[PDB]
């Protein structure tokens, strides 16, 4: 099975698929090794790793190349975040085949207007055009197009969020990511209970961590849960602490023991494979 | 003071300068905030973050662009690792002005032969040519060229390591990074005691962590200590643990509390500055 | 004089400054050698060279890196085309310092809305915000910000085109590029005669080639003329003809004599400089 | 048929395959349209277009990304120039899958030592290792690995050039590119007459243009002829002339008529396709 088939199989199978954020190939490799179903090529994580806001500031090329590098490192599906498609439906048409060719198995595109204005979401028909352009542009039918509905977040209400989801599924979306920034899952659970569409839902429970996977498994309508930014957060927490200790201790004499060893990083780098290559071809 | 002046001032001042590894701008920003003197644009860390060996596999462009991005984020000097110069003295000549223009305040270039052969170091005169090409190519005289001597590691002995260091300083090196993979500092300390050159030494005590900064401060001949790969190691240690917990707990309900908050990452991303910009220019 | 000073000197001097399109560093080098005042880092030319439409499809990174490469090759000022700023005023703020750091001496930003809609220009105050963000973001005050007014092209009339130009100059534009796609210069000349602002105008006479430099010199209000796309056009014309001849002749036996020699390209590549470098540093 | 199959079919078919140099996707598109069999992703042409010597100065990433862009534009096979493999057999192993994934249908790798020394070619067994690494690294067996023999050029004689070719074919090369800088084809024709290997030869007759395709068709042992640098040469010849005319005429009033029209470039950019996309998806 190709990665695209694998993701499509997980969605048609009814099993709940988990995807973890990654800001580089090493972190994606660790997510694979930890057992997550797929990698989330998070725009928030990559822009955070560049110390720039997640407000379409980071170059699209930086993100597309990071997706290429991650897909060439892991064997599990990569779901790439393409923000608002980097433009209108015409840009979508030109952009999607690049993400597919980079090896992503899905893209997530949201209906926020872009760029931000000094009215928060684009018109329903305009987004329908963008999703239809994305599905028209993909080569492999198994590649997945996920439409992200921002209407709850934009404060437009549940009726409108469901109306948009249905319009997007009618335009070709393979799944609907309904988002919420509330600190409790009530708004999301009410949307789920009311969702009437045939395609599966996608949740990013970052703001409402109390909704566990067992709680999500109980929602037959959800096929994917995404851990949106826990790798960059974990990284920051530990780097900041090790740096503060090194400066307080005046050195690495204390901190060294606790850290993963240099040998462990060399193994994560594929040293083994490289030695086989040197042994069989360096002459 | 420009960053190049700042680094040159630290070297001429006699104070011991500390530089910490960083594999992205966010980590470089944390090193700055923790109080390190400069950033080490480590080839080992960047290749590890790509999950490829540190054996000249990673594209030079990937590293040069990462240096640009780090220098545009921090206010402290960036010392860039240029491995063996990506080629001979002619490549050095073309490559150095790019690293300088990217905003690096120094480059470290080692005398290993390249590419690796199926004799371990290049000829002394050939490396002298490479260092002279680097110093000839730089525009700002304050930009620093550091020659890294691999002779101890290559097992060529102390006499040869010192002979090479002196030849490189005679060719124009502003400092000599003497390296060692021993688990105790004896080999390095004996080299230091014997070093007769006028330029300062640089140590990367990764393999012999028991040599503390107070121990290094006692070596008047050393002007720089570099923490070679502690950021990627710290990152791996924490990402791996958070991923394993999320998979064991079936969710983020437990791990969320401990992590730095999303709001903390947004602040590290420069959200404040961005709000001032939106407030004064988005109309 | 730095390049930014040189461009500012040409603008304050009253002399008419000429800038020629270039789609790569070699073509920019030829423009310099032909005697043009500066290079026009045309988005139309670079997208045409990629065989994609000039409709914000080409990655911004591809263009920014091409500007870097051109500025590192020529000694004359580079005026970079940044389309609509790749976003709103916030993107402008983040984008301008990158073009400045790449070595461009000016940017040209137009008031078209972006992305294109299924109302043609952005609101006057919104563009004023974008220009003010650009001038706020530049480090060197000599770097030039040129506002391009699309109102004639958008069919909004002369009064509105002048109103926009004046608003942009009031927001900080150092010059106003008034554009026209008419096949005669009447619309442009009438705008010029009516222009009341203090800053100089910029013309791109591509569509009305009969307006010569002597005709433009007679317009004291114009300080810059840009040849918008003549390099890619010339290139296409000759490549297409040589390819057709090679296929008709079944070889290069006939076409070879007419072509510039391989030795001539090697000289344009800086072979001389490289031999001096090899001679003095390859040891 | 995929492009790799198409190239393999041309090689097994006995027909003579023609490939033309291209320094960008537009020029590659013109070569396709002129009727050449494939595109030659020339390192000389791309470095010349950057105004840097063809001496491994140009970044490998710049070339790899240009190959991606060319392959995404044309429908015919792309033969990519990978110089000496950017390193030893280990680099070859890591580099080949990237060129394959970029969409190249073949790579050409030469046996020159690298980097150049202050002995001209690598050891036969070392190159055999590099070619075996390339064939081991490719995913699709149809992808073609071409070994370029520099022994004639290095002045090592015909016996050694043939010995190297045979060793490389024994290591897995699908074809042997025998090169010569002589101004007459005698050296090349004598090598051809003596060539005993089973795989086809590749010629780059740039220096001896009098060897026509009809002359090459008569050499049953040659399966590919490459026009090495005629696109950049044609481009330079015409750009230089148009620039000189514009400066002599003080404008474009005279030169405009002769040039391909702006409308012609817009068509080469895929405007048609883009209008269909806008018409069916921009809503
Ligand atoms: O991870 C991301 O980039 C996301 O799109 C989800 P967020 O908008 O909740 O950060
Ligand atoms: O950090 C690096 O990349 C170094 O050059 C030091 P190392 O060789 O000890 O890893
Ligand atoms: O050369 C360009 O890209 C221009 O902006 C001028 P045009 O819009 O007339 O092509
Ligand atoms: O076109 C190239 O880059 C070639 O490798 C052939 P050359 O070495 O004859 O230029
Ligand atoms: O080669 C891959 C290995 O590295 C890992 O990710 O597990 C699955 C494989 O396909
Ligand atoms: O702007 C910079 C700030 O972000 C920090 O790094 O401290 C020093 C400043 O120059
Ligand atoms: O070095 C430059 C040379 O190459 C040319 O462009 O003329 C001016 C110089 O500054
Ligand atoms: O779409 C392609 C077209 O643009 C051209 O190159 O001819 C063959 C096609 O596959
Ligand atoms: Cl990273
Ligand atoms: Cl990164
Ligand atoms: Cl080009
Ligand atoms: Cl290019
Ligand atoms: Mg996002
Ligand atoms: Mg290193
Ligand atoms: Mg333009
Ligand atoms: Mg070549
Ligand atoms: Na990153
Ligand atoms: Na990284
Ligand atoms: Na180009
Ligand atoms: Na080019």
**Are B152 and B161 a contacting pair, CB within 8 Å?**
yes
Which chain C residue has its CA at the smallest distance from A62's CA? C61
Q: Count other Cβ atoms within 10 Å, centred on residue A227.
A: 26
- Per the annotation, the verdict on C54 as an active-site residue is yes
Spell C208-243 as b/e; 16+ CB within 10 A means b.
Answer: bbebbbebbeebebbbbbbbbbbbbbbbbbbbbbbb
What is the DSSP annotation of A154-212?
Answer: TT--HHHHHHHHHHHHHTT-SEEEE----SSSHHHHHHHHH---SSPEEE-GGG-TTS-
Phi, psi of B81 (to 5 degrees): -85, 115
Q: Is the omega angle on the peptide bond into residue D115 within 30 degrees of 0, that is, cis?
A: yes
Rounded CA-CA distance A18/B251 in Å is: 10
How many whole angstroms from D48 Cα to the centroid of ligand 11? 10
- Mode of pairing for the β-strands spanning B144-149 and B175-178: parallel
Q: Which of B115, B118, B129 sits opposite D91 (nearest CB)?
A: B115
Which residues are within 8 A (CB) of B97 and not within 5 positions of it... i.e. 6 or more apart? B137, B138, B139, C72
Rounded CA-CA distance D203/C134 in Å is: 53
Best residue in A70, A96, A109, A283 for a mutation probing chain D (most D CBs within 10 Å):
A283
Spell A45-72 as b/e; 16+ CB within 10 A means b.
Answer: bbbbbbbbbbbbbbbbbbbbbbbbbbbb
Q: Is the omega angle on the peptide bond into residue C115 within 30 degrees of 0, that is, cis?
A: yes
Rounded CA-CA distance D212/D217 in Å is: 9
Supply the range of the domain harboring residue C142.
1-283
Rounded CA-CA distance A225/C240 in Å is: 53
3-state secondary structure of B161: helix
How many independent structural domains does chain A possess?
1
Rounded CA-CA distance C77/C22 in Å is: 13
Spell B105-138 as b/e; 16+ CB within 10 A means b.
Answer: bbbbbbbbbbbbeeeebbebebbbbbbbbbbebb
Nearest Cα to C159, choosing from C170, C149, C144? Answer: C149
- Burial of A214: CB neighbours in 10 Å, binned 0-12, 13-18, 19+: exposed
**Are D147 and D176 a contacting pair, CB within 8 Å?**
yes
Token digits of residue D87: 């390193």
**Are A158 and A196 a contacting pair, CB within 8 Å?**
no
Is residue C37 within 8 angstroms of chain D, CB to CB?
A: no
Token digits of residue A192: 């789920």
Rounded CA-CA distance B59/D166 in Å is: 32
Token digits of residue B195: 């070093």
3-state secondary structure of A41: strand
**Are A178 and A165 a contacting pair, CB within 8 Å?**
yes
**Are D46 and D62 a contacting pair, CB within 8 Å?**
yes
**Are D69 and D46 a contacting pair, CB within 8 Å?**
no
Q: What is the CATH number of the domain that holds D136?
A: 3.20.20.60
Rounded CA-CA distance A190/A157 in Å is: 11
Method for structure elucidation:
X-ray
Rounded CA-CA distance C94/C137 in Å is: 8
Nearest Cα to A22, choosing from A50, A53, A44? Answer: A44
How many whole angstroms from C234 Cα to the centroid of ligand 4? 24
Rounded CA-CA distance B38/C43 in Å is: 38
How many whole angstroms from A230 Cα to the centroid of ligand 10? 17
Atom 10 in ligand 4: residue holding the nearest Cα: D44
Chain D residues in contact with A126 (beta carbon < 8 A): 282-283
Spell D42-51 as b/e; 16+ CB within 10 A means b.
Answer: bbbbbbbbbb
Is residue D269 within 8 angstroms of chain A, CB to CB?
A: no
Residue to mutate, B28, B40, B43, B66, ligand 2, most ligand atoms under 8 Å from C-beta: B43
Which residues are within 8 A (CB) of B192 and not within 5 positions of it... i.e. 6 or more apart? B178, B201, B219, B221, B222
Token digits of residue C270: 């800086």
Q: For chain D, where are the alpha helices, taking DSSP H only?
A: 3-13, 25-34, 43-49, 60-71, 89-102, 124-137, 158-170, 186-194, 213-217, 230-249, 262-268, 271-281
Which residues are within 8 A (CB) of B43 and not within 5 positions of it... i.e. 6 or more apart? B54, B58, B63, B81, B82, B83
Which residues are within 8 A (CB) of B84 and not within 5 positions of it... i.e. 6 or more apart? B56, B109, B110, B111, B112, B113, B114, B122
Catalytic residue among C54, C142, C186, C249: C54
Q: HSE, CB side, 13 Å, CA atoms: give it for residue B14.
A: 2
Rounded CA-CA distance B239/A238 in Å is: 9
Atom 10 in ligand 8: residue holding the nearest Cα: D75
How many whole angstroms from C2 Cα to the centroid of ligand 3? 26
Interchain CB distance below 8 Å, D246 and C239: no
Q: Structure resolution in Å?
A: 1.9
Chain C residues in contact with B125 (beta carbon < 8 A): 283
Is residue B136 within 8 angstroms of chain C, CB to CB?
A: yes
Q: For chain A, where are the alpha helices, taking DSSP H only?
A: 3-13, 25-34, 43-49, 60-71, 89-102, 124-137, 158-170, 186-194, 213-217, 230-249, 262-268, 271-281
3-state secondary structure of D20: strand
Nearest Cα to B22, choosing from A69, A24, A28? Answer: A24
List, as ranges, residues with CB under 5 A of the ion ligand 17.
A 23-24, 49; B 24
**Are B200 and B225 a contacting pair, CB within 8 Å?**
no
**Are C87 and A56 a contacting pair, CB within 8 Å?**
yes
Q: HSE, CB side, 13 Å, CA atoms: give it for residue C101.
A: 17
Name the β-bridge partners of C225: C18, C203
Rounded CA-CA distance B114/D115 in Å is: 8
Q: HSE, CB side, 13 Å, CA atoms: give it for residue C145.
A: 28
Query: Chain D closest CA to A272's CA: distance in Å?
Result: 13
Which residues are within 8 A (CB) of B274 and not within 5 positions of it... i.e. 6 or more apart? A53, A55, A57, C90
- Burial of C72: CB neighbours in 10 Å, binned 0-12, 13-18, 19+: middle
B120 backbone φψ class: left, alpha, beta (φ>0; ψ -120 to 50): alpha
Best residue in D64, D275, D283 for a mutation probing chain A (most A CBs within 10 Å):
D283
Residue to mutate, B75, B269, B272, ligand 6, most ligand atoms under 8 Å from C-beta: B75
List, as ranges, residues with CB under 5 A of the ion ligand 12.
D 24
3-state secondary structure of D205: helix
Rounded CA-CA distance C199/B211 in Å is: 63
**Are D152 and D187 a contacting pair, CB within 8 Å?**
yes
Q: What is chain B's length?
A: 283
Residue to mutate, B146, B204, B208, B230, ligand 2, most ligand atoms under 8 Å from C-beta: B204
Q: Which atom of ligand 3 is nearest to the CA of C228?
A: 1
Is residue C126 within 8 angstroms of chain B, CB to CB?
A: yes
Chain D residues in contact with A70 (beta carbon < 8 A): none
Q: Is the omega angle on the peptide bond into residue A115 within 30 degrees of 0, that is, cis?
A: yes
Who lines ligand 7 at CB under 6 A?
C 32, 74-75
Query: What sign results for the dihedral spanned by CA atoms C167, C172, C175, C181?
Result: negative
Q: Is the omega angle on the peptide bond into residue B115 within 30 degrees of 0, that is, cis?
A: yes
Rounded CA-CA distance B129/D117 in Å is: 12
Compute the radius of gyration of chain A from its Cα atoms.
20
Measure CA of the first residue to CA of the last residue in chain C; give whole Å: 36
**Are D38 and D9 a contacting pair, CB within 8 Å?**
no
Token digits of residue B136: 């000839």
How many whole angstroms from D44 Cα to the centroid of ligand 4? 5
Atom 1 in ligand 5: residue holding the nearest Cα: A75
**H or E stretch covering B216:** helix B213-217
3-state secondary structure of B202: strand
Catalytic residues of B: 54
List, as ranges, residues with CB under 5 A of the ion ligand 20.
C 24; D 23-24, 49
């Amino acid at each position: 099975m190709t990665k695209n088939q694998a993701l499509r199989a997980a969605l048609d199978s009814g099993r709940l698929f988990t995807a973890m954020a990654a800001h580089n190939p090493l972190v994606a490799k660790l997510a694979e090794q930890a057992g997550f179903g797929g990698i989330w090529g998070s725009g928030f994580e990559l822009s955070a790793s560049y110390a720039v806001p997640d407000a379409n500031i980071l170059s699209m090329s930086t993100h597309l190349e990071m997706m290429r590098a991650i897909a060439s490192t892991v064997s599990i599906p990569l779901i790439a975040d393409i923000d608002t498609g980097f433009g209108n439906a015409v840009n979508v048409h030109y952009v999607v085949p690049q993400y597919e060719a980079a090896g992503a198995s899905a893209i997530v595109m949201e209906d926020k207007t872009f760029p931000k204005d000094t009215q928060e979401l684009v018109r329903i028909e305009e987004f329908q055009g963008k999703i239809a352009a994305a599905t028209a542009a993909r080569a492999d039918r198994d590649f997945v197009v996920i439409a992200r509905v921002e209407a709850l977040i934009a404060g437009l209400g549940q009726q409108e969020a469901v109306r948009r989801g249905q319009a997007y599924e009618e335009a070709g979306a393979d799944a609907i990511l309904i988002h919420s920034r509330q600190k409790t899952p009530d708004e999301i659970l009410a949307f789920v209970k009311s969702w009437p569409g045939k395609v599966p839902l996608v949740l990013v429970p970052t703001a409402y961590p109390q909704l566990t996977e067992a709680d999500i498994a109980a929602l037959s309508k959800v096929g994917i849960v995404i851990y949106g930014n826990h790798a960059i957060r974990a990284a920051v927490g530990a780097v900041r602490e090790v740096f503060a200790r090194i400066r307080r201790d005046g050195g690495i004499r204390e901190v060294d023991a606790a850290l993963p060893s240099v040998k462990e990083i060399i193994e994560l780098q594929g040293d083994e494979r490289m030695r086989a290559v040197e042994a069989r071809y360096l002459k």
